[PDB]
Prior knowledge:
The chain is an alpha/beta fold. The chain is 32% helix and 27% strand.
Amino acid sequence: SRITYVKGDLFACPKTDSLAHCISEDCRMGAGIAVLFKKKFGGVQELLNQQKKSGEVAVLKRDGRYIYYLITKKRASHKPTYENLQKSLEAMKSHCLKNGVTDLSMPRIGCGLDRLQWENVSAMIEEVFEATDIKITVYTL
Ligand SMILES: Nc1ncnc2c1ncn2[C@@H]1O[C@H](COP(=O)(O)OP(=O)(O)OC[C@H]2NC[C@H](O)[C@@H]2O)[C@@H](O)[C@H]1O
Ligand SMILES: [Cl-]
Ligand SMILES: [Cl-]
């Protein structure tokens, strides 16, 4: 399985894992799991400065690993398309490969406030990450 599921706190995953979640170009991160990424890691200024757009990924390097901000939409209030999620995931994959990331932890990205369906997102993750050695762990409370 590409994806392993864990019930609990995403933020208690291994300190060596890289992390991922979805935000907008606005980097407001005011709700959902995002507000917890904001509290824990900050970095809003640095993220804004990367000037990443829908379908891209912004990245913070912290403690030797990476925190991926999947930029899946323009405004905080928008809802993403599957196409832009997929492009952001592909951007993360490319960065992972180039930088030797092998272990990612994430929530059920796109499938809370952003209204996507995990039956689709899971399959998308499997298709995007096939033929890599990148192990994904998905957390839920
Ligand atoms: N506080 C908290 N703890 C743990 N898991 C949570 C929490 N809040 C939401 N979730 C879960 O995280 C999953 C993803 O939902 P959400 O956090 O709403 O992320 P989306 O990717 O759907 O939406 C992203 C958008 N919301 C704020 C961002 O900046 C984006 O604008 C999902 O299963 C939610 O139930
Ligand atoms: Cl946002
Ligand atoms: Cl900063």
